């Protein structure tokens, strides 16, 4: 049973008890029900808050990133034969704003990968089905310089081998934070400038940034050797928090996001024009 409270039948009043009057200076919100200020009937309440539970509010796979990777002939100028993405919920706005209703969080994370591909050029023959490698590289591990160098041997790093056309790839991740909860907001620095420092560059940090690499990166490549004709692919990453817990509520972001921190730049006018005595 998760239903809300029944409305109580309430009659007329002529008393020294005054629930309608209060003082919001105290910091508290007046605990009033309709029966405190109007005559009410008895209602047996069946409605429920099942869908607004923290889990139910976040129980949805959100698009957090679009990684583009090519399979073509290895030439000698900059190419996308492999790609790397810094793991974050912040290249996208939607889930970011939902998570930001709270200061701290703790959860397991589900990653789902939708992979799409197409032909780039009108025609140089075709391509056989591609296998994609998605390698997790935790902070410290060697990062690839080349689409097929030794790092891809992935002996200790976790990797997904996705076959094109198969159902979207899916994995789960534990609560991997260094703290007892994830900090959606960090008012402070990773370094302090000391009076005894040589340059004053030594103690300079980014405000509100914590560890430099936070959760590491995802390195994506096409395992197949190149066809004559070029194939371009995109890996869309869907992120879902599960077994979620949250602490300290915050006002929602009201103006557009300007990078990873609380910084605003413009469209600082969220509210519309409406006349005071206009319905």
């Amino acid at each position: 049973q998760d239903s809300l409270p029944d409305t109580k039948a309430s009659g007329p009043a002529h008393s020294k008890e005054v629930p309608a009057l209060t003082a919001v200076e105290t910091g508290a919100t007046n605990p009033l029900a309709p029966s405190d200020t109007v005559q009410t009937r008895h209602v047996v309440q069946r409605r429920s808050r099942s869908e607004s539970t923290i889990e139910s509010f976040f129980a949805r796979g959100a698009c957090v990133a679009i990684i583009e990777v090519d399979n073509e002939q290895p030439t000698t100028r900059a190419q996308k034969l492999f790609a790397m993405w810094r793991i974050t919920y912040k290249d996208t706005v939607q889930l970011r704003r939902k998570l930001e209703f709270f200061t701290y969080s703790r959860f397991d994370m589900e990653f789902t990968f939708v992979v799409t591909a197409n032909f780039t050029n009108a025609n140089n023959g075709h391509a056989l089905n591609q296998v994609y490698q998605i390698m997790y590289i935790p902070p410290g591990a060697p990062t690839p310089k080349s689409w097929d160098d030794y790092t891809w041997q992935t002996s200790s790093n976790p990797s997904i081998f996705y076959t094109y056309g198969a159902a979207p790839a899916r994995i789960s991740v534990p609560y991997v934070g260094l703290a007892n909860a994830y900090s959606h907001f960090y008012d402070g620095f990773a370094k302090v400038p000391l009076k005894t420092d040589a340059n004053d560059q030594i103690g300079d940090s980014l405000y509100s940034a914590m560890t430099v690499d936070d959760f590491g990166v995802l390195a994506v490549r096409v395992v197949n050797d190149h066809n004559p004709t070029k194939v371009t692919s995109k890996v869309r990453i869907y992120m879902k928090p599960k077994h979620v817990r949250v602490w300290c509520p915050r006002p929602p972001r009201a103006v557009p996001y300007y990078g990873p921190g609380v910084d605003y730049r413009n469209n600082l006018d969220p509210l519309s024009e409406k006349g005071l005595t206009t319905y």
Binding site: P139, G140, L178, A179, N180, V192, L194, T196, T211
Partner: protein, 60 residues
């Protein structure tokens, strides 16, 4: 200490938890976690660096 047995000496070894100026003088080093090693028949000294951190796990 891999010196001769006829050799004597007292050494201070220290650990300063993060956040301040890295010690350039024994005077500053004395103020943190430290062991004053006296050389003698027991050849070796052990300083334990205690887990003192803010986060539950540090990065490698």
């Amino acid at each position: 200490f891999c010196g001769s047995m006829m050799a004597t000496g007292k050494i201070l070894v220290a650990y300063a938890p993060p956040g301040a100026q890295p010690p350039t003088s024994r005077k500053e080093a004395m103020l943190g976690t430290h062991v004053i090693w006296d050389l003698g028949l027991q050849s070796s000294c052990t300083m334990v660096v205690p887990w003192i951190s803010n986060v539950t796990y540090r990065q490698t």
